Ligand SMILES: CC(C)CCC[C@@H](C)CCC[C@@H](C)CCC[C@@H](C)CCO[C@@H](CO)COCC[C@@H](C)CCC[C@H](C)CCC[C@@H](C)CCCC(C)C
Ligand SMILES: CC(C)CCC[C@@H](C)CCC[C@@H](C)CCC[C@@H](C)CCO[C@@H](CO)COCC[C@@H](C)CCC[C@H](C)CCC[C@@H](C)CCCC(C)C
Ligand SMILES: CC(C)CCC[C@@H](C)CCC[C@@H](C)CCC[C@@H](C)CCO[C@@H](CO)COCC[C@@H](C)CCC[C@H](C)CCC[C@@H](C)CCCC(C)C
Ligand SMILES: CC(C)CCC[C@@H](C)CCC[C@H](C)CCC[C@@H](C)CCO[C@@H](CO)COCC[C@H](C)CCC[C@@H](C)CCC[C@@H](C)CCCC(C)C
Ligand SMILES: CC(C)CCC[C@@H](C)CCC[C@H](C)CCC[C@@H](C)CCO[C@@H](CO)COCC[C@H](C)CCC[C@@H](C)CCC[C@@H](C)CCCC(C)C
Ligand SMILES: CC(C)CCC[C@@H](C)CCC[C@H](C)CCC[C@@H](C)CCO[C@@H](CO)COCC[C@H](C)CCC[C@@H](C)CCC[C@@H](C)CCCC(C)C
Ligand SMILES: *C/C=C(C)/C=C/C=C(C)/C=C/C1=C(C)CCCC1(C)C
């Protein structure tokens with residue numbers, strides 16, 4: 072309770088934990104192989120986030136980085152979360168549209184570059200260089216957003232309407248929520264330091280629960296996750 | 302030789318190295334694609350363990366963690382081993398039964414959570430919180446054990462008898478040996494400290510060689526690893 | 532500019548960045564799923580290397596390792612690069628020949644052992660033991676080279692001539708360039724220290740740009756990356 076942001080770390084831990092349990096129960100019983108892949112992906116995402124929220128809450132996932140002459144509290148565990156959960160979210164989208172394997176590779180690899188350069192920026196001790204990593208990471212994010220909108224152009228032919236509809240909704244959820252993360256980091260504790268860590272943590276908690284549990288609720292309620300069967 | 306547990310680290314290095322060489326030789330010549338996947342998986346497992354045993358033996362894979370007011374010797378290299386070798390062992394089981402891809406994802410991701418939360422527990426400086434990570438990791442292990450027993454329920458129909466027989470044996474080997482690891486950690490150097498590090502290292506060496514080389518000997522001697530062919 | 536090797540780190544950053552941009556543009560428009568996988572793999576390789584070259588240039592990817600009684604500058608970011616880019620290069624080769632999945636596993640796992648034991652050697656504080664890790668890593672490299680020459684022996688039957696021709700060329704490029712890396716490390720800053728870090732960095736920059744951008748130019752100009760189509 073000693074860090075003011077504890078309350079949002081606690082709330083994020085609880086909501087990710089409850090979302091995980093909900094999705095775990097919800098997928099109990101499903102047999103359809105296509106649906107099993109979406110439940111597995113979609114349940115792992117908040118499970119991983121639960122563990123990394125808890126590590127921040129307990130202090131394990133926090134480190135001090137000197138930059139600006141100051142000792143700056145940097146929650147590194149966010150990058151260990153996102154390293155796994157953001158490619159998993161992209162895989163859910165990619166599987167929905169039956170993406171080609173080359174496209175999945177491009178997406179997962181650009182996402183790794185996005186998170187790994189964000190982690191390098193988050194831990195860089197020369198203040199000005201932190202924003203160079205932010206820019207490179209943002210370029211990788213823009214590439215991902217580009218592929219999500221313009222990289223499935225051969226798939227439209229042979230896409231079930233309900234898959235098309237659930238994919239468009241989740242793609243729009245993804246583009247809006249993910250695009251807010253570079254802005255929060257830029258103005259927050261890792262970047263310019265104009266928004267305090269307390270509020271930054273709240274913002275990422277709202278984004279994360281929305282991008283993982285809210286995304287997952289929309290996907291897992293959809294018929295698009297089942298193969299078409301008589 | 303300065304740490305009493307060196308002898309078990311040396312013995313573990315040698316047995317993993319010899320098991321690797323044996324499996325490498327044994328799979329020389331196999332053409333069958335199914336069998337090649339099992340030899341590859343099963344040979345990589347003790348090869349990786351050989352390197353991490355050697356890193357503990359040479360001291361690289363040891364760190365001191367303050368907790369309990371004391372400086373506690375924690376062999377972190379075990380988690381770098383298990384991060385790769387325990388999903389590989391699960392993949393051998395999963396391939397045997399032709400598991401659905403969603404099930405393999407669930408298994409590999411729960412296993413990553415199990416090892417990563419065990420690593421966080423192993424390095425946590427607040428003593429009481431180490432057991433919170435142990436509990437979460439144990440929950441993930443129990444999920445894996447649950448899936449190995451109740452998650453292949455559609456596969457029984459179309460399973461060759463020899464695959465069914467080798468899978469049941471290896472599944473039983475896996476459930477018994479893996480379940481001992483949380484107990485050893487709980488009573489050993491990472492947990493309550495009731496069993497000294499010397500004996501703990503012996504216990505994990507016996508478990509590891511059994512779970513990797515003993516498992517691999519049972520699998521690789523089986524006809525279940527070959528596709529059925531005239 | 533304070534470290535004499537900065538100029539090769541700068542040149543390597545620029546050439547990897549320009550190679551990435553070139554391959555990104557070059558693959559704009561390709562529809563063929565086979566070709567998309569090769570463009571994705573082959574574009575990610577210099578993109579990742581660009582980020583790790585930049586991290587060395589900016590100092591983030593450098594650490595000091597005590598060994599020999601001295602504080603030795605070790606660029607660890609090379610291992611974070613190679614951890615991802617060397618399996619990706621192997622995947623390009625493997626996909627060219629339609630390798631069996633067991634063979635791809637063997638290659639990617641031996642490559643992980645090669646890079647992870649090279650990283651352990653690079654950070655080991657007992658000088659003599661650094662060469663033990665070098666030897667193990669070299670054994671893994673020799674295994675990979677062995678598989679590239681003798682592990683596709685069932686694939687020769689059903690291999691298009693242009694795939695066979697591009698694969699032989701890239702395989703020869705790979706064996707020659709990769710084999711130089713253990714020699715550079717052995718005589719350079721990480722090993723015996725007979726070649727200064729400045730020259731070592733130049734050597735790895737020439738190898739890396741050749742093994743990634745030069746390799747990629749040969750592959751991506753080939754018809755072998757397209758499925759055979761009327
Ligand atoms: C899915 C859910 C039930 C998760 C609920 C949210 C939760 C994890 C975080 C909320 C913290 C909350 C209790 C706030 C008040 C603090 C308080 C207790 C007293 C203050 O008092 C103080 C004074 O400084 C702090 O106490 C010590 C530390 C604790 C407060 C933190 C404990 C860790 C957690 C509560 C989480 C435990 C994880 C488990 C789910 C493990 C089981 C795994 C498995 C079976 C799948
Ligand atoms: C597959 C096998 C042959 C492995 C055999 C077991 C072994 C790796 C560990 C046993 C240690 C043992 C010799 C005990 C006595 C110590 C002693 C030498 C003297 C004591 O004297 C002392 C005094 O404190 C310590 O010596 C210095 C360190 C060494 C003892 C340790 C050296 C490392 C290893 C012996 C392993 C080397 C790895 C290789 C396989 C590399 C090749 C890779 C490739 C070709 C695939
Ligand atoms: C693809 C290319 C355009 C890459 C070009 C090469 C380059 C990255 C490295 C060359 C350094 C060079 C300018 C040498 C002179 C130094 C100098 C400026 C003055 C010396 O003056 C000094 C005194 O000590 C140092 O300056 C401070 C640091 C900088 C010199 C380094 C800045 C980082 C880089 C220049 C790279 C930026 C990365 C971007 C591509 C981000 C955008 C991502 C996205 C849109 C895809
Ligand atoms: C968020 C992101 C930036 C992260 C992206 C990925 C990331 C984790 C990068 C990792 C690269 C690298 C380790 C960097 C080190 C930095 C540093 C300063 C020191 C680190 O930290 C230290 C300091 O004490 C220890 O590291 C050395 C040991 C290793 C970390 C573990 C060794 C592993 C092996 C030798 C075993 C072989 C593994 C394989 C077989 C894997 C293949 C799987 C297969 C079987 C299919
Ligand atoms: C046992 C477990 C807990 C481990 C589970 C996974 C694990 C390794 C978690 C890693 C997350 C994270 C790095 C945590 C950092 C903690 C910390 C305090 C600081 C670390 O350690 C430090 C301290 O000096 C350095 O880290 C920063 C640099 C990075 C480690 C490496 C950067 C990688 C990239 C920028 C390149 C892009 C990579 C991708 C392209 C990968 C995608 C593959 C593709 C091409 C298909
Ligand atoms: C170049 C090579 C040697 C590297 C090869 C791989 C490598 C990165 C090895 C990593 C092992 C290990 C982390 C070693 C730690 C060393 C040390 C001294 C301390 C480190 O560094 C520290 C010091 O502060 C922090 O580490 C602990 C936290 C973790 C690093 C991150 C935890 C991750 C999780 C708990 C979440 C679960 C992840 C999974 C779900 C992944 C599965 C994917 C799925 C969903 C499909
Ligand atoms: C589950 C959490 C999700 C969906 C997180 C998304 C994170 C991002 C899109 C992060 C992007 C970043 C940048 C583009 C620039 C650097 C800072 C980051 C890593 C916050």
Ligand SMILES: *C/C=C(C)/C=C/C=C(C)/C=C/C1=C(C)CCCC1(C)C
Nearest residue numbers: 419435438439442479482483486512
């Ligand atoms: C090759 C080595 C094998 C099979 C290792 C298995 C390791 C485990 C099943 C570890 C489990 C753990 C817990 C469930 C709780 C926390 C402590 C661990 C990581 C030892």
Ligand SMILES: *C/C=C(C)/C=C/C=C(C)/C=C/C1=C(C)CCCC1(C)C
Nearest residue numbers: 649665668669672709712713716742
């Ligand atoms: C893109 C960069 C490439 C192709 C790098 C290749 C790196 C190697 C083949 C590294 C090999 C090493 C050894 C065999 C011994 C230990 C030192 C290393 C890691 C340099």
